[PDB]
Each structure stands twice: as C-alpha cells, then as structure tokens.
C-alpha cells in the first residue's frame, strides 16, 4: 500500500467533494478541500475574491496553495483541487511534476447530468485535465443501487491497483473470461449482468469497437464498470492476429494500450509479434496492470510440438509477462492431446492455451486459466462456448461430479438456502443440488450426509453452529474468533470450517455504499445470534472503536472478555456516553424487532443516531438490521425517518452470507441478481 498523497483533479460536480471524502475514508487518509484551504487562508470566499482581485491574482494564490500542499501534505492526504486549478500554467506544471516524481494525479471525470457554459468550460479544460494527470476514472451516473455497487467496487479495485496496494490476483483454480465482442456495449447494456454469469474476468476486444478513439474506448470501459466489478482484460487485436486493428498503425496501438494503463485495467494484452519497442514501452509503463503476452497460429497448421510454440512461450517468460496465451487451431482431436503435453512441459508462467475450431472444443473445456466464453447476445465468430456449455461438457467428461449440498439445523422447514443455491447451480449449469435436513445431533448428520461419496458441503444454522466445529480439521480465523461454523466443505485430509455470517454483514454495508475499509467507528445493539459476527465484521472493516448498547450490562461485559483487546469494544453505560460516542457511522441492530424500542436502550440509540448527520466521511451513516422479519423494524423506521440514516433490511444479510457460502461450496462467483431474487421470492 502506497503512503503517497493522491491529488484529485477534474470538473466540479456537486458531489466530487463526497468522492474525495469517500476515497480518504477508504485509504485512511485525511481529506483536504483545497478551495476551503484558500478561502480560510485569505479570509474570503473564492467568488468574492475573484470579483474583487481578478482572475490572474486568484490563480496566483491558487498556485501558491498548491505549492504548499503538494510538499507539506504529500503523505496521507486526498488533495481535492479546485476544478479550475488547470486554468493556470503554474499549477499545471506542478501537477505534471507531481506525477513525474511518482505521485498519483487522478482525473475524476463526471457526467454532470449529461446553461451550456458547463459543456464549454469542459471543452476548454479537457485537454488540460488529461495532460496534468497520469490516471483517469469515470464517476458515471447510476440509476440503480446495483449499478452504484458495481461502480464503487470497480473504483476500489482501481484504487488498490494504481496505488500498488494489491495487484489483481491471477486465478489459481479454473477460471473463465467472457469475451466482449460488441461494437458498442450500449446495445447490450441491460444484459451485461447476465452476460458475465460464470466469468472471473471480462475480455474487452477494443479492436471490435465501431470507434477506437480514446473518448469512445473510455466510455465503453465506463459502461462495464457500472455493470461488473470483474477485472478487465484490455485487448486490441490486430488484423495479422485475427482482429480488426491495422498492424501498421503502431503509434495508435501504443496510445490505446497506454490508455488502458491510465484507466487502471487489471490486464493489458500484448501481442508477441508486435514490434519489440512497443512491447518494452508498455511493459515498463504497465505499473501494476498485468500483462498477457499472446500469440495465435491463425493459419492453424502448426502442431503443438513445433519449435515456434517453444520460442513464443520463452519470449513471454523473458518479457516477464504475467500470463502467456497461445492459441492454435485443431484439425483433429489429437491436436488437443498434443497441447496437453505442451502444457505439462511449460509451467514457469501461468498459461492460457487452447485450440480454435469445432475439433478444439476439448482443449477449451480442459483449459485452466481464463477460458474464453461467450453468450448468445454477443457476436461469437471464434465459436467459444457459453458458461453452460462449458460446464455441461466438463461434467460429461468427469471434470465435475454430482455433488450434494445441505442446510442443517432445527427448525429447517422454512430455510431459503436451497432456493438460493439451486438457482445459482441452474444458471451456471452445475450438476449440484441443495437440500435441507432437520437435525439436532451432528453425529446423525455425519452418518447420513457428510460421510457419503457425493458429499459436497454443508450450510449450518441453529442449533448446530458450534457442534459442527468438531468435524473441521481446518478452521477459519473468523470461525475461531466468533466460535461458530456455518459452512463446512470437504478438503484434503479433512474438512474446512468457515463462518460467512460476518461476510454477509460487511458486504451488506459495502453494497449499500460504505467503503470496504474505513476509519469511522461502529455500534452493535443487542446480543442476538449475529452480534458476535457483527463485531468481527466491524473490526474487519477497520472500525477503531466498536460501541455496545444493551439492556443488561452483564452480557456486554462478557462480550468484551470474549474478543481480543485490540478490538476496542466499549460499553455505552449511560445516555451521556451515547451522546459522546465518536464517529459512529455503522450500526448493526441485533435486538428483537417484534417489540418497540424503549428504556435506556432507546435513549442511547437516539443520541447516536442524532450524531450521524455531520461527519463528512463520504457516505451516509448506515444501519444494518439483522432480523429477517419484519422487513422494516422499529430501529430501521427511527434511523431512516427521524435521522435520515441509510437502512438495510435483514434479508440483505441473508443473501450476502449465502453469496459467500455459494463461492465456498462451488468455487464459482454466484450470479447475484438471480440468487437475490431467489431468496426474496415467496
Ligand atoms: Cl447455533
Ligand atoms: Mg494446428
């Protein structure tokens, strides 16, 4: 993780102050509004200063503030510049110098509800914004909560990439990449969530766009980031490699590849036949974007024992590509078996390798890394399999086996876990099925379900969340700390016991606009079944303090003893202490919701809810209700209507803990829209 401050530039939206605050909350940085910094230093508002002292004077003082901030606050700050800072060449050179010295100058582009004066300040400034920044991100306009979640998650991965905090992790298991081949993604915009079912990345074929200008390419990536937080593989396939981009337009190719890096794509594709100066420049400027070095035998006459494949693979190793990709053509089914022997002999780098053609299907089914898949709504001239066909054939050759998964507990009749997981299996065409099993003894569960040849995994609910832990040979850290297991899967030598209850809580917050890491504090109300997972989740999110409110203190005093001291659990003993609880922006209610709030508990809650409105952390104060019924609980009604908190019903926690459970059971990312709908449907 980089400690260097981030400078944000770009046109002023009425909420780009919020975005810089949000980013600061995520990074643990301080937010510095450079406009207010100038206004407080000079003792006057910016508007009054301009009309009284002139534009030239204002830009001089703006440049002076920039010079101080860029060196005095060069560590641990989000420096939010005034929108017009790029109007002065003094400030422009300071921005360029900051990026030249290894800093991030981030151009946050906004739609501004896409008074013609705005479009036209934009026309005058747009080139300046580009030249003064080394990174660009579209803060697009979203119309649904799911679009907002995709954009923010895309933003998080982007920030983690460009700051060097965390590179995209190359998949170790089987993985797939849906190949986006549309000339304009706006034609399938409402289908993108379904198109990406089963994919671990999206491969963007830039050369297939109807327009390859930088503006069109950037808008296409914006469309994706509103509908998928999957990592992007950015590909400009040339004509000599089966694509549409002319091989002779080398400067234009380099510019597009550099544009991908500036947009923080997870992977950029490089053709091994490209001029080596182009390859070396991109690789030396890739930063933390990963490189896939690709060669394709277009005429398809090479055999997999040909020396050309060895030379190409070794070129990929010698250029330190993160992934090598070699694509042949199958003129017989033996071409796929020859390729398997090649895969066995070249393991220094991760390798994407398969044969094209109807006779090459076997190689695409057996491929391990980022297997290209398509979708009925996309052009598919290369003839890739859909996720369902890929999973169908893999089962039919023995790659999958008919596994059985179960939810266990008592009572179990009204569990919605089977509906969630079976809908996920259906959409992925997995040969799995999910059932329920009423039980009070974990030993009858082991004899009937676990110790069976087709045992896939367990979902565990009351009253067996501790009794099941005796069968786990490997325990998750969260399972140990919370002291309960709700997911059991077979592994080598035994079984893995995990707890996804806390994952359901934090992802509920994240999906509601909360950054996945923050600096503010949290509150847990009550001692319900998910109160332990709530504490663990709040600590995972980075809450410096976790306050506790309850009717009885003895339950809370034992709660503090049962967690590590560095969790900073603090009991709210009085109403006065509730009024002075600092920076409480997250609340998990774990109290019974069948009765109304009353007593000292209500008075403590009201004071904390009242203090949530003015903290400027970049997101609304957010309350998560743990109770599944009723949908709107008294604490929810109070926080939302009286104090204007953001409010999350308990059903969201259920979907999100099942979402994580689905990944642990199957290894696949669950299709979120489908499993969310399946748990809600009555
Ligand atoms: Cl339990
Ligand atoms: Mg061949």
Author numbering: 856 to 969, 984 to 1551
Paper quotes:
In the human fungal pathogen Candida albicans, ARO1 encodes an essential multi-enzyme that catalyses consecutive steps in the shikimate pathway for biosynthesis of chorismate, a precursor to folate and the aromatic amino acids. In Fungi and Apicomplexa, the second to the sixth steps of the shikimate pathway are supported by five enzymatic domains combined in a single protein known as Aro1 or AroM. Aro1 forms a flexible dimer allowing relative autonomy of enzymatic function of the individual domains. Our activity and in cellulo data suggest that only four of Aro1’s enzymatic domains are functional and essential for viability of C. albicans, whereas the 3-dehydroquinate dehydratase (DHQase) domain is inactive because of active site substitutions.
The structure of Aro1SK-DHQase-DHSD contained four copies of this fragment in the asymmetric unit. Aro1SK domain spanned residues 857–1,032 and was connected by a short linker (residues 1,033–1,038) to Aro1DHQase (residues 1,039–1,267), which is directly followed by Aro1DHSD (residues 1,268–1,551). Notably, each Aro1DHQase mediated homodimerization within the asymmetric unit and via crystal symmetry. The regions corresponding to residues 844–855 and 970–984 were not modeled because of poor electron density. The latter region corresponds to the “lid loop” or “P-loop” that is involved in positioning of ATP and shikimate in the active site. Aro1DHQase domain within the Aro1SK-DHQase-DHSD fragment adopts the TIM barrel fold typical of type I DHQase enzymes and also shows significant similarity with the corresponding domains of the two other structurally characterised fungal AroM proteins. However, the active site composition of Aro1DHQase shows important differences in comparison with previously characterised type I DHQase enzymes. Notably, we failed to identify residues that could serve as the catalytic dyad typical of type I DHQase enzymes. Finally, Aro1DHSD within the Aro1SK-DHQase-DHSD fragment shows the two subdomain architecture typical of AroE-type shikimate dehydrogenase enzymes. The crystal structure of Aro1SK-DHQase-DHSD provided the first indication of interdomain interactions in full-length Aro1.
